Amino acid sequence: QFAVIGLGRFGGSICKELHRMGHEVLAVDINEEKVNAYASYATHAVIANATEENELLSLGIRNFEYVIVAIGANIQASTLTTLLLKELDIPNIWVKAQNYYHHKVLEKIGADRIIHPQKDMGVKIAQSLSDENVLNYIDLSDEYSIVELLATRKLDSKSIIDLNVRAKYGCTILAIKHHGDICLSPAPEDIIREQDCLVIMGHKKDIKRFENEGM
Amino acid sequence: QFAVIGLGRFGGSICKELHRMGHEVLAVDINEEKVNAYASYATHAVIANATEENELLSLGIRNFEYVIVAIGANIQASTLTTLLLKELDIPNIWVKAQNYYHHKVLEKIGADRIIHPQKDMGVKIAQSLSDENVLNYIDLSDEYSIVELLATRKLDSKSIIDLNVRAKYGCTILAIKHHGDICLSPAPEDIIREQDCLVIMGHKKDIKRFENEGM
Amino acid sequence: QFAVIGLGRFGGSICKELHRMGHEVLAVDINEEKVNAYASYATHAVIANATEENELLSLGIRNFEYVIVAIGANIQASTLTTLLLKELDIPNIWVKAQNYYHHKVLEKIGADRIIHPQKDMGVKIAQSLSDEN
Amino acid sequence: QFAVIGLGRFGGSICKELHRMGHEVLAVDINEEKVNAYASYATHAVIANATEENELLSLGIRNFEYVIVAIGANIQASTLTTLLLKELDIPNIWVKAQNYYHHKVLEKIGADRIIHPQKDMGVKIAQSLSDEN
Amino acid sequence: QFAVIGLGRFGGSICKELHRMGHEVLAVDINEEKVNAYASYATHAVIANATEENELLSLGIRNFEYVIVAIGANIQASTLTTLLLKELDIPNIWVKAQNYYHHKVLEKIGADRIIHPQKDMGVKIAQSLSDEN
Amino acid sequence: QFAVIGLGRFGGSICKELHRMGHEVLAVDINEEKVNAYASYATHAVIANATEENELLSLGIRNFEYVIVAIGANIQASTLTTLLLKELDIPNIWVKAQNYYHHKVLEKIGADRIIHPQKDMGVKIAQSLSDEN
Amino acid sequence: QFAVIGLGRFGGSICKELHRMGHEVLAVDINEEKVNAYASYATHAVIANATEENELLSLGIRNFEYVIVAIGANIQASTLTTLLLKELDIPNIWVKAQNYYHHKVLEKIGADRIIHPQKDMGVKIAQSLSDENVLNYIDLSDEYSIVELLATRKLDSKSIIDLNVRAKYGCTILAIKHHGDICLSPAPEDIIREQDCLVIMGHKKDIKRFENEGM
Amino acid sequence: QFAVIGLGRFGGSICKELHRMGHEVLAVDINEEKVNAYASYATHAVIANATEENELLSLGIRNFEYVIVAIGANIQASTLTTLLLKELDIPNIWVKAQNYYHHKVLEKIGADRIIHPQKDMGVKIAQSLSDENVLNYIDLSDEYSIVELLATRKLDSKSIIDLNVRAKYGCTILAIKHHGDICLSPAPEDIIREQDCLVIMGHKKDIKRFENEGM
Ligand SMILES: Nc1ncnc2c1ncn2[C@@H]1O[C@H](COP(=O)(O)OP(=O)(O)O)[C@@H](O)[C@H]1O
Ligand SMILES: Nc1ncnc2c1ncn2[C@@H]1O[C@H](COP(=O)(O)OP(=O)(O)O)[C@@H](O)[C@H]1O
Ligand SMILES: Nc1ncnc2c1ncn2[C@@H]1O[C@H](COP(=O)(O)OP(=O)(O)O)[C@@H](O)[C@H]1O
Ligand SMILES: Nc1ncnc2c1ncn2[C@@H]1O[C@H](COP(=O)(O)OP(=O)(O)O)[C@@H](O)[C@H]1O
Ligand SMILES: Nc1ncnc2c1ncn2[C@@H]1O[C@H](COP(=O)(O)OP(=O)(O)O)[C@@H](O)[C@H]1O
Ligand SMILES: Nc1ncnc2c1ncn2[C@@H]1O[C@H](COP(=O)(O)OP(=O)(O)O)[C@@H](O)[C@H]1O
Ligand SMILES: Nc1ncnc2c1ncn2[C@@H]1O[C@H](COP(=O)(O)OP(=O)(O)O)[C@@H](O)[C@H]1O
Ligand SMILES: Nc1ncnc2c1ncn2[C@@H]1O[C@H](COP(=O)(O)OP(=O)(O)O)[C@@H](O)[C@H]1O
């Protein structure tokens, strides 16, 4: 179902994670050491030059719905490989881009999705920096969002009804995670202890307000 | 308030994003071209060798609450920088790790947070791969999660009350985004049209079940 | 009618010859000396970075039916330029290829004609060697 | 009858084309991969450093009426090879020139024909652009 | 009982002297010549990259109570080796420091003793100059 | 009474320690920063190129009974300096050796004592490892 | 009148010596330090790339009757320089050759004189080796030579008439240098003291004979 | 009788020339190709590292009265070799110097003669440049010299008595070389034809005078 062509810092993580999730993954790499190291973290692991068409054919690359092109430094190899894959009519080709130019040429040679890892981690890290309590989040729209917050010493031993967010800030609490244990859509009697995960939902500015005065 | 020491693919994104959010950021780089290119995307931009203590002092680095060490290839430079910063009693030092070894030595020299960008993008990309319908998601815990899904033709013109997720699958719908318009905590009469954003919340396997039989 | 983007050993020859035949040619080059040397061998000669879209727009590159991409060594610059030209709906884009890979990426990004100079002169020279008469 | 010393974009084409025409061609190259790839496109293919006289002798280079010096980037190697060949009394020595200077030194050391591939393809491409019909 | 990882001016001396005293010493080195030269001055001598964990395991490095990290110039290799050894729960890890920074990072990753050779020989030489008698 | 020509890891230690013991020491260094840093750790500190005879004369190097040549990496500078000092009839010349070869040439050019810092600290460290008590 | 293009071990010596003799010399070098060091040993000294024609023109290189190309390692630079100089119609171009190939190409591009320094010093050193008594010499032809000899204890207090070289060995004595004082075409009564300079002239083998039995 | 340790541009010439003169020479070289190439130009040729004492012993280096150290670039190897040779009490050790420092250390480690090839060829070339007619010469003293001159079109078909040098310039002609044929101490009736070798003897300034007005 999944084939990962470059087993580096980026692609290797994709391989290991997909394997950990329970999907079947074929790992490819030109470097034998890399192939050996990922033998345990993949259904199958093969030594192959992804820029060589007959080798791609030998891999049975056609058996796959998703092929990930994760060769970092060598732009030539990456775009050539992506090209060969597009020739073989692979349904989904995901390639890691190094820069603007690489993104452009991948764009035109029919890459289905282009990933800028360090860029995205850039914005994500910026998000966590801007607010140290936000552990994670998802934006529903330009104005509305669901936010994951780390409870500070302002929130310990407080009940949901005490923190009347539904009226005071127009936001609603969705979940509380205490010592790994999880409470979904909790009732107003429930207690939030410090260092716990708190999942709020509402307007961005309203959530910021609640963070400011509340915690 | 924020200082970014390495203006590369990773650090540059952090800088640009922090600047876009409205925070004041001091960008550092040994490469003059990089400093010039990030002049517009930062409050201040300086040419400096982050491995030279007197230069760090010249930057007024102690005036900052958060310093980001984002020098990629040069592990020596990274750990040296982190060390010097730790000597200067910087409250929060975030460093990009290249490998396991780098993570360990940064860990021991008192790095406050160590980031593996390509790894994390690895797992999230794996997440988007496992379901093309999940546009985004957030893990509340090992078993429970909030998921954003792309509506298929199986869900078109279906009501929330028609798709009884709260009893049949034990999960709860949180939001519906239809042509950009947004419905928060929608009522059972509401309609879901295909290709719209659907926000479900619950157990991972249960949501997977709902994906399987429902859509 | 004709624009030549790279004034090197290859492109410069195209420019000079087209000019000698009596056609009007706009010569482009990032190197000022090259532009100066071909001032006499072209209707107009301009300093410009062919990988910069706004510069291409400033050249009035769309007013041309034929644009020749003759940047040799820099594969990246060549393909990026070809790309920008393809975006600007240029009717005929002819590019000099460095190798097989360059030929492939140029092929896919919609190059109208891809030339392998050394190859073609190769077969031509072989022809001349086969019968000197 | 024919020997091609540099199996690159230029020389490789000469080799392949001469072989395709039905002439017997000896392909030389310092790079083993190139030699391997042109085994099928030549009567014989040999790994050799064309700047080493004893290797040239080992090739039986004197048995040839036409020897082609097609080493691109390395001007030094090119002129050294041409020189050694001129010493071995080769009847016809054709060399690919990189620039004006290379053309001059090849000219003086007795090169029988000096080819500027990109230039000639330049004028021919200009010809084709001038009248597409 | 003793393992010396870097057989240079510093570590080689440790090895030779420990061997001369009658203790059993395992000498390690990435350079084959060094390993060969110290075969006679050690119980066992092995070619190995001290920055590679599986090689460390292959050496049976855990069987040793004292491991000496004596890699000079390469600070990275030194700290990486020290780190790997600290992971393998080596009881006593003594490392040669190049500078203040190296001393600090070795200090934090749990080096049992950090030696500054030139400094100590400095103070001792000063002692000898102060009273030659 | 004492002159230290190289203020590095080795020589700087000698200087600082001799100064701490109460002897008068003249510190030399080609690097101004080094001279500045050791201003407090020496009776006098001077910027000078030890391979330049007139500079040595300007230092009043002959007024000293002991001159320490502690220039590490630069073997040439070290031996040249030692040589100039031997010409100037310096009573005691002590030089830091880099390797066997350096030891040999220093040996022949009349060095009074040749020190191998890393070697000696090597045996010393081996001693400390043999009996931790 | 004289221009030296390469100020290295070879060319620098030519420059310095020509300057010491009293001729006016323009020294050229691409290396600024070299140009600075030869400022005192030349009429003029200039930083210039000898492979750049416009720079050569800027030097006023055509105003010179003799131009010396003494660039060692870089054969390409040497031949290119020689070529450019030949284009500028320089009357006399002397170039240092690195090897046989270099000698040949310089020969063909119209070098007026090609020098192999280490070769020539090779043969002369061989000459001084064959007889430690020959301090210097000059070959008139393949068979005949003029030789300068160091007097041994076999020749001490001997007269020219005592050592009848003109008949017994067919050679003729030309000069005697005794404690620096010099005697040209000395009379038969003159005495030769040991360790003095003796200038004989004749056939090589005959002089060797005289060395053998005489001294 | 002679051993040459470095078979390069310099040492190889010494070897070949000594061999051509008829002396027996042992050539040493660490490079096998060099040893093979000089097999024909030496009595014996051996592959050896001159910095290795036991190899020197294996060569039978002790059998030689003269050992030439002609290793160019590697100063360390040169001085180390010279040192080893001095330890083995070789009577005559001649070494090629690269620079001032090398000359100094060779001087102190007991080198019997130190040669600066390119320097000496420098002064020699300067001599031939200063006067194009002087082919060679030997200085008897600061003021007096014997000079070899190339006859110009001023001297063709002239008799020695016509060019009364013995009175007019105080100099005396010693030899005339015509088409390889040689005339020693020629009588006044003899003719000098152009392009012939002419050997004059006398005062330097006087010889210059004769060159000026005569030829
Ligand atoms: N032609 C190729 N075929 C297959 N695998 C390749 C090829 N070129 C590179 N790779 C693999 O891709 C990986 C690149 O990893 P890396 O350079 O760390 O990129 P990233 O930083 O994106 O992880 C390497 O592990 C290498 O083995
Ligand atoms: N010692 C240093 N001090 C300051 N900046 C540095 C230093 N070393 C490297 N840099 C900067 O850090 C940047 C590294 O970026 P890059 O190598 O792309 O890392 P990444 O791939 O993680 O973005 C370079 O642009 C360089 O200018
Ligand atoms: N990005 C660019 N935009 C515009 N001109 C460029 C760009 N990159 C290179 N050039 C020009 O193209 C020319 C390339 O010529 P060259 O490298 O000699 O190729 P060739 O050998 O095929 O002629 C150079 O003279 C350079 O000035
Ligand atoms: N010294 C040499 N002897 C023999 N062959 C050589 C030598 N140097 C280079 N070559 C060969 O000549 C070829 C030159 O090809 P290339 O650099 O592509 O020139 P071009 O661009 O003109 O084709 C290479 O394949 C190389 O193997
Ligand atoms: N990664 C490594 N693994 C094992 N041994 C190493 C490694 N790197 C260097 N060494 C060895 O360590 C020794 C270091 O010696 P040297 O550089 O002279 O240090 P010092 O000057 O302290 O003696 C070398 O002999 C080298 O072979
Ligand atoms: N020619 C010279 N004259 C005077 N001082 C010199 C000369 N060459 C080097 N030095 C000084 O000697 C010091 C050498 O120290 P270093 O290279 O660290 O050797 P070590 O590692 O043995 O201390 C340098 O600080 C330099 O300033
Ligand atoms: N292209 C050039 N133009 C001018 N000077 C040059 C050029 N290339 C080299 N040189 C000079 O010529 C000198 C070469 O000297 P060197 O390598 O010692 O030759 P040699 O050993 O024959 O003296 C260098 O000092 C360098 O500065
Ligand atoms: N350790 C050594 N033992 C023997 N021969 C050596 C050694 N090192 C170098 N050589 C020889 O000395 C020669 C040096 O020649 P080269 O570098 O041209 O110097 P030069 O310019 O004085 O001729 C080389 O041919 C090499 O084979």
Numbering used by the authors:
A (entry chain B), B (entry chain A), G (entry chain A), H (entry chain B): 8 to 222
C (entry chain H), D (entry chain G), E (entry chain G), F (entry chain H): 8 to 140
What did the original publication write about this model?
KtrAB is a cation channel with a nucleotide-dependent RCK domain. The structure of the KtrAB complex revealed a homodimeric membrane protein (KtrB) assembled with a cytosolic RCK octameric ring, formed by the KtrA protein. KtrA binds nucleotides, ATP or ADP. ATP binding induces the adoption of a square-conformation by the octameric ring and increased K+ flux activity through KtrAB; ADP binding results in a non-square conformation and decreased flux.
We introduced the single-point mutations R16A, R16K, A80P and E125Q in KtrA and tested their impact in the complementation assay. However, and contrary to our predictions, none of the R16 mutations had an impact on the growth phenotype, while E125Q resulted in an apparently inactive KtrAB. Crystal structures of the mutants that did not rescue the TK2420 growth phenotype (A80P and E125Q) reveal a different picture. The ATP-bound structures do not adopt a square conformation, displaying L1/L2 distances for A80P (at 3.9 Å resolution) of 52/23 Å and for E125Q (at 4.1 Å resolution and with two different half-rings in the asymmetric unit) of 34/30 Å and 42/27 Å. The ADP-bound structures are also non-square, showing ring conformations that are very similar to those observed with ATP: A80P (at 4.3 Å resolution) has L1/L2 distances of 52/22 Å and E125Q (at 4.0 Å resolution and with two rings) of 34/30 Å and 42/27 Å. In contrast, we found a large structural variability in the non-square structures, with four different conformational groups based on Cα N38 L1/L2 distances. This indicates that there is a single well defined square or active conformation for KtrA, while the ring in the non-active (or non-square) conformation is most likely more flexible, giving rise to different ring conformations in the crystals of isolated KtrA.
